[PDB]
Design a binder for this molecule. Structure first.
Ligand SMILES: [Cl-]
Ligand SMILES: [Cl-]
Ligand SMILES: [Mg+2]
Ligand SMILES: [Mg+2]
Ligand SMILES: [Mg+2]
Ligand SMILES: [Mg+2]
Ligand SMILES: [Mg+2]
Ligand SMILES: [Mg+2]
Lengths: 292, 303
């Protein structure tokens, strides 16, 4: 199945929601040519031991989420920003890989190397533990009955799994040094930051990555909880997901001004990147194909 | 001055009937030797001494009973880690019960690190310490926060999201995995999936039995404040929805590997057994659960 017949209307509805509840639009970070090459060279070095090449185009597709979904008004540490570019991208490769290619002995040291290059010692350990936890989770839940149970039971069980699985807990734990903002740092470290933003990131990603995922047998997508071929059921389900995003956004507005800017730029930036990037244009292309 | 007292007997029976149907295996209490209990209590007293308030042996024993009842003794391998959880649980319970004027991070964080370094190896000590630091910092920073109000009053979903950290269950998991030395459990503890799976089962039970105390102290972190407890129909509807939440989580817990699900279910059910037997939840204000207060004239010369 596919959600293509709903693409135009659902995009309009997401956009209407953002226009009313978030208003401020995300802004894209411009890296210099030098900066982008440093990021790509670090990405290539980290995945090369796994034996698969990743094209410059595929790296630029992956990196766009970081470019669009941070909070430029508040950025203090551009070395931390580059780290998030690299770490996001290389864990994206692992997400797209056949688990036969997962080699922890070769990859975990590369993740440590990245963290120690860009962060102070304490932040490096926090970022590295979160990266290690994410790639371990992605690996251990391929073909797991736990994943089946959490993804097929209810939206609540599913989003609970996604706090880690989508990578948002990792994101917050590698991004707080960008801002050096004490309250944001605490919400990152308790994972309240990831929990506040999981549904807004996941409902958007799930809608636009559905066609790819169902074609690959991937079950981690909330729209598989409804019959997408039943337009009535799909619309009621979609509305319930919009309601979840709105409630989260309204509660995010209770956080301090800087933290809420970061959280909302993340959710909205992810929507802008997702709806423009080649990764989500088609189910199988040269930036999203399974790495085998 | 609202209360769930009229519902106490029926709601206890309904929780018990749920456990008898869905969990079955009863929790079992760990017996510590006298020396082990004294080691724990001595470490608890040392850790809280810098904060300046005496804690009786009776109060420590009240706090420690949750660890004695809600771990998984079939699977315990590291009793040093188990003693650490006893101590860490207890001393963070004191912090939970304290007025925030008593909260001295400069004095207390080193004592948390000392406990962790005594009982865990170097990596585990860092994980337990960071989780302890995160919890006590969260408890303090949310005492008067608009964020806590928003999350606690909006919906059950926002509320249980706050409680993953606030009830202390993420801390519990991150300090408890060394007890079991079980790879899968360790991973679920470190992603917090373990905490997320068990939050509702712990929090719904705790909230029902701690409501009367919490309302009397103006504490808003309780899901039963989302309903009008004086309206029997509204209360029973809300209570039923919370039981459904517990049952859905328990059924998905049973998809985890056998040892991990044993530990998660012993935590949820053990907490219920301790909560429904312990003096801490028998009345709203007593000498094991009273607010630990800073005296306004602590500095006065007539002391
Ligand atoms: Cl999947
Ligand atoms: Cl409270
Ligand atoms: Mg994935
Ligand atoms: Mg994927
Ligand atoms: Mg997806
Ligand atoms: Mg309390
Ligand atoms: Mg508390
Ligand atoms: Mg309570």
């Amino acid at each position: 199945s596919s959600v293509r017949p709903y693409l135009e209307e659902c995009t309009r509805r997401f956009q209407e929601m953002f226009d009313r509840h978030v208003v401020t639009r995300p802004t894209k970070v411009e890296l210099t040519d030098a900066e982008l090459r440093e990021v790509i060279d670090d990405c290539n070095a980290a995945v090369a031991p796994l034996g698969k090449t990743v094209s410059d185009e595929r790296w630029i597709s992956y990196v766009g989420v970081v470019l669009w979904s941070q909070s430029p008004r508040h950025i203090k540490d551009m070395e931390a920003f580059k780290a998030v570019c690299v770490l996001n991208c290389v864990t994206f490769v692992w997400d797209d890989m056949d688990p036969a290619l997962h080699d922890f002995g070769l990859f975990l040291p590369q993740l440590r190397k990245i963290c120690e290059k860009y962060y102070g010692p304490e932040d490096a350990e926090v970022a590295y533990e979160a990266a290690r936890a994410l790639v371990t989770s992605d690996h251990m839940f391929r073909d797991s009955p736990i994943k089946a149970a959490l993804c097929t039971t209810s939206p609540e069980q599913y989003f609970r799994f996604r706090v880690t699985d989508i990578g948002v807990d990792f994101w917050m734990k590698m991004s707080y040094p960008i801002y050096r903002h004490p309250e944001f740092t605490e919400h990152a470290k308790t994972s309240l930051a990831a929990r506040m933003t999981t549904r807004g990131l996941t409902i958007v990603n799930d809608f636009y990555s559905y066609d790819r995922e169902v074609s690959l047998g991937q079950i981690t997508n909330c729209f598989r909880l409804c019959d997408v071929s039943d337009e009535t059921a799909f619309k009621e389900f979609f509305q319930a997901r919009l309601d979840d995003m709105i409630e989260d956004i309204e509660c995010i507005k209770a956080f301090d001004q800087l933290t809420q800017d970061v959280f909302l730029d993340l959710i909205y930036g992810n929507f802008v990147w997702t709806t423009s990037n080649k990764r989500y244009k088609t189910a199988v292309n040269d930036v999203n194909s399974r790495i085998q």
